[PDB]
Design a protein around this ligand. Sequence first.
Ligand code: RCP
Ligand code: RCP
Lengths: 750, 748
Amino acid sequence: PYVTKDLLQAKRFQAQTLGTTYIYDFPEMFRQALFKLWGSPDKYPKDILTYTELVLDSQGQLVEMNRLPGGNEVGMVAFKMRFKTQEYPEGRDVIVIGNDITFRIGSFGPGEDLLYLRASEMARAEGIPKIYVAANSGARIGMAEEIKHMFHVAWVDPEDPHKGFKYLYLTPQDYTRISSLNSVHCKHIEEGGESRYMITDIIGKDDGLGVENLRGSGMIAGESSLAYEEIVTISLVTCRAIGIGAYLVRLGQRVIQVENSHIILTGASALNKVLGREVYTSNNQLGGVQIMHYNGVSHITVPDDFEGVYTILEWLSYMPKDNHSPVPIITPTDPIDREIEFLPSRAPYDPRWMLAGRPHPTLKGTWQSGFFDHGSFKEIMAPWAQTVVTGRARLGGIPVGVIAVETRTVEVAVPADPANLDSEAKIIQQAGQVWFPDSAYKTAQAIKDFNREKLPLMIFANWRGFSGGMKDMYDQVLKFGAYIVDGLRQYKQPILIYIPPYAELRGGSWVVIDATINPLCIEMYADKESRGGVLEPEGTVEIKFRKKDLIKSMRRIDPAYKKLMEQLGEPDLSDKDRKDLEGRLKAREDLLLPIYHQVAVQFADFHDTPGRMLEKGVISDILEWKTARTFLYWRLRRLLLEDQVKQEILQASGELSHVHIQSMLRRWFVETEGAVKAYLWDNNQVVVQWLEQHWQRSTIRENITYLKHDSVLKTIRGLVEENPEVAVDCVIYLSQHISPAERAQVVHLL
Amino acid sequence: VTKDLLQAKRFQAQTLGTTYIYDFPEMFRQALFKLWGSPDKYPKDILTYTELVLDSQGQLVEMNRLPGGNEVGMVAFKMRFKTQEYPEGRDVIVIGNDITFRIGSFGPGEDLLYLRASEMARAEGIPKIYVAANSGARIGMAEEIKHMFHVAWVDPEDPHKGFKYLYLTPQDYTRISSLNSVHCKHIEEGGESRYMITDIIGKDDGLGVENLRGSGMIAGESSLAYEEIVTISLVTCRAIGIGAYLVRLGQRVIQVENSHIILTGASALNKVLGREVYTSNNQLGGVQIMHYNGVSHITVPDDFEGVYTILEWLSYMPKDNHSPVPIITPTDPIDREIEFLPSRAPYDPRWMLAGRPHPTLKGTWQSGFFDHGSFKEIMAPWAQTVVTGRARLGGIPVGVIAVETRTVEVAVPADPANLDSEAKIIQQAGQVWFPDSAYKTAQAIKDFNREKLPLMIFANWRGFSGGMKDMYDQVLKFGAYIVDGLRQYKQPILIYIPPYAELRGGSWVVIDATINPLCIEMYADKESRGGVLEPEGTVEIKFRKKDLIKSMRRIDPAYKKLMEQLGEPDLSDKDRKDLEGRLKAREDLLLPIYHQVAVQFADFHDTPGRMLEKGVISDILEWKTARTFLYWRLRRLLLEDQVKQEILQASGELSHVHIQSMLRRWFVETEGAVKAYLWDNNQVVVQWLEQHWQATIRENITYLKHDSVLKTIRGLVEENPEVAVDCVIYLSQHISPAERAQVVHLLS
Ligand SMILES: O=C(c1c2ccccc2cc2ccccc12)N1CCC(N2CCC[C@@H](C(=O)N3CCOCC3)C2)CC1
Ligand SMILES: O=C(c1c2ccccc2cc2ccccc12)N1CCC(N2CCC[C@@H](C(=O)N3CCOCC3)C2)CC1
């Protein structure tokens, strides 16, 4: 019963004027975004986008159907979508939930809450991404309207109402109507020898008025917490997100906020009324882009709903079809065999340029290539914690999370507090190559988030340590520093940490990143022109090469300081000669000392080389930036494949040792390829070529076959050994579905 | 050795304002004595301990030998001490730096001991106590080269023209080449051959980047330890760098007063910053900062009282991570009433928890909710809007979260490094979550969940602090963390809205039962309140001026009489304008009065009555009886979860629908269907569980094992018909000769 002229036109106008998109016009928007991503009419596949509406049936379960648009029994709609993308030409599935803002200002009733619940639950059922379009007014609020205009007031003094009232009540005739409906609890009182029904509680005939709504928020709040742990969650904020709306967005983490919009818990109109003054001017003042985009809650901003949708697909580009598929590697137009044109220097630079490249400064149309595949690097949480840069990219078409360090002094404009006229906007300096509380957090968030995308991670390490002065310590830098340790510990994909040219990893920043946090996943590489150590060289000298040592160094190298020999060696004691040289030696001491300190600092530095890193087995290999792209490509591409064989199958069958499994994989290489060819196992490329002989009579799967079969041998032997009572009744179970021919085989054996 | 080693090293420790590492065991004994009260109340062998020691193959071997002689800057003991809740003993692994070894620095060997000792703590599921007195990762240089290198100057007789490179003579290089101490390229400077230092490696191990590695290792270990076992930490002198990160990664931390937790010291920062900004290390990481920011859970005046807190904290916690929370027979009887009465006006939450000195009495105590003396607070000075700690209800240990109702004043300190910033005083409203109350709340929830404790939230929140500064300050992030924390909770969570307490809006949402329906039970006091908005706000939206007017038309005789007069329109404009004026007069008079009646009408929706009808709460409760009621419900819920989660779940893997129905169905079998209603009685149920299980007891549980094991094997054969006929003929080994004829006819 939904009419196009009547229902459709008006509802879209109603979303149009709210500055949002009517919920049933999003599927079509997704169709249009994909068409752009494919770049033409002549490059477009058959069914770019298939969808189906998820609809709650009479017993609160979802049922796929594709009725016409509109006509939804709750103010939320869900769709199961499939769309042919470049990473998945034969399709990838996805679930989109979103408020019908036209329906009761997008309020959250128990019915709405339920659909979102089942939609989310299903998404997790199939391990596929959950897109949520936030356009709402938070939990629904209501009263007992029925009873609102029945109740009478027992005044303390009917002449003077400034003197208040005793209670509220209903007369017997009033109560008789509402009696059986159990709308109202009230104690039968007999004031003035007259019968009244003194209200004690008000329930309401109608459902979805109060506390039930709050529970129903927490329910979908909870669900949304779990889903962030299990599947991909992306969220689009278009008109507004309030309270339960806001919390849903945030629990999903990844958030695309449209500019007009806001993300609030309590609106300015409200806050003004509680506080008592005109404190806040707008809802955009509280939770608009210029707050959330700048504090990390919103990962990225978009100018309109369409660029939202487009980013959603743009994000899903890097991420696996589901939470049991691998990351979509695509054939790159950007060559792996090339060099990186952009070189990072002792001159401070935007780390974006080394990642994504930049326009060639000394040329017209030329581009300076960065480390990643041209055009692939897409940043998130940019204006927050600008001391670190986080985002995703592609290396030879392999998707990957990126973590880079800013090397220019950053400034941050913390805004003045509107509930405090004794405050103003402050600007705060932030040093390059330093973890602050905000960078520490952002860095840990990126790690937490990317891990959930099953993405591999590339950290371009260049940190001198954590900020450690009072304010930053007070501001809990230590807590967030420790989450970097928590985050990498729990990572389950390859992490490649790489110190670039003229970059450095010093002290506590090395500690929270070191390979031994996650031996199975982390590999640490230093550039030929990088540095690393506990302290900086100046500091090492300050502690471990002090003045006493410096004068000794003089006593050795500097020939002039053989005044010392002249001093002590020959026995001659005169106030003249003995006191003369005594001051004259000090003379030279003073002249040489600052320059020997400069030597001392160089001596310190020569300890901090990648030369020594490799020697003390802390980094895997020493690289060269020009040819680092291609090295890390084949290494990344191998590690992904080794990881597939091991976890996916080998561990999903043998349940055997990780040290053991590495061996058993190499054991197979040497076994079929020969001992004479064994050395090549250390060559990344050749190993990838050999791996596809098995993965893509499979030398490797024929082995996994034998493992998983022999594994179920020991599994049934353990139970029957543990539980000899079952064995007898068990043989008859296996006999029901054995084999009529082999049934006699057994039937005669024992 | 005794005088030389012991007296010296003790003086050496003394002068650094801390205890010698080997003297700690005796403090634990001395602490234990104070914990037991009188010497008559002592137990047999109060403390037993062995030292853990690395062997030739880097593995911990227990031994008992003379103190001193630790061959690495780190020491650790395995201790068994007898406590009140564990009279026959409980185990822990103590581990700490030797500040007297090498400024208490961390080298690879020091790291390895920590690694192995923590690994062991996790292996055995037992707590890991960590004593911090250190100086972060060890730093060193290739001394050998230090004493051998030469400088190739730009000009010999004026070294201020600088130097080209450093180098070794070919002679000197032939002493070193075997040792791999230094890498260098050959070079000729005016026909003299020189070996130009390119890299310096060092003969002696443990100089630089390898120490960071070894730090990163025990950080990773520490990070995991917090997930598996209880982890406590005491900073006695200073924890530096890696030492600061271990202390933090283990979360629960006791800081002695003049000590500090830092990364880079005040000295270093001053040089780097360019002026003498910081006067002390305490200024960066002393009690005054770390206690006020959540890093330090509690502060102590000395080591002894520090060791005591360790015992005092462990007293709430289970002996290992596969044992249940230690209930002890209470002295404060379970059946009394709570004498403190939460007021409509603000009060100190702690009073309703711990009780207070009777204001109108001589030496009387006003009882609180929990056992007397039993509530101990953590993170007191930080995020004071919320209160976190541990208490006991009838001897049942339990994590505690309570809300502040008075106004809070946080005295944020001036950053010496910023010439502009002077100190400030921030007011923080009560009954409100802030970026810190939220953080503290979820931080308490995660800490306590790892102790395997039950949680008790005496909820009293009007909502999250909205508004710009708090929203800019990421309140929305930490608010979400409360959801995650209760979602992941694995013990019982009892939420009680006490008398004159309220639970509103987003504060309801992030604390609801549906977040974790297997653990969270919600209760509202008879005089408590709850709902979407405050009544003042409900009225602002759903009971507006036009509507207040409609009420007056209905229910005000004066007002109603005025209308009646204008209802006979046959009068002069004088009378028409007058009565119009009068009626406006009357509605202006009444609007503030009717606003009050409208808020009260709104308020009658927010009642615990309604919560119960709409099923958001499990029961309405009365503060006097609150203590006794919850005690039995907690005790029941614990036993139920004990049988269920431990015993019952080990057998089958079915849903919790059976586990509940089945547990009850068993009760109704052994106790009759007439006596079925008592399943709703907590005490009868507690009595029942003990008298049967602890003292279909494990006959029904046994029967679960067969149908489960068979089920398991079925799926494997369903999955792999490959295995079928090899297993069937492997199983001709297992079946009996008499059982053979049993099956041979049964199958043929
Ligand atoms: O190596 C030294 C060091 C010196 C470094 C440079 C010049 C002089 C130094 C003198 C030192 C003296 C003693 C120990 C270490 C020293 N460090 C001292 C400073 C250490 N911090 C690393 C982290 C970033 C910096 C830092 O914490 N800041 C920078 C931002 O504001 C907060 C304070 C410096 C790095 C280690
Ligand atoms: O119900 C109302 C509400 C009013 C409450 C009390 C007095 C006047 C109110 C007026 C309202 C008007 C419109 C909607 C809701 C209103 N609330 C709106 C504000 C909500 N916040 C709860 C959290 C604490 C408060 C808050 O955010 N503050 C607390 C003090 O610090 C600054 C920020 C307000 C609580 C719910």
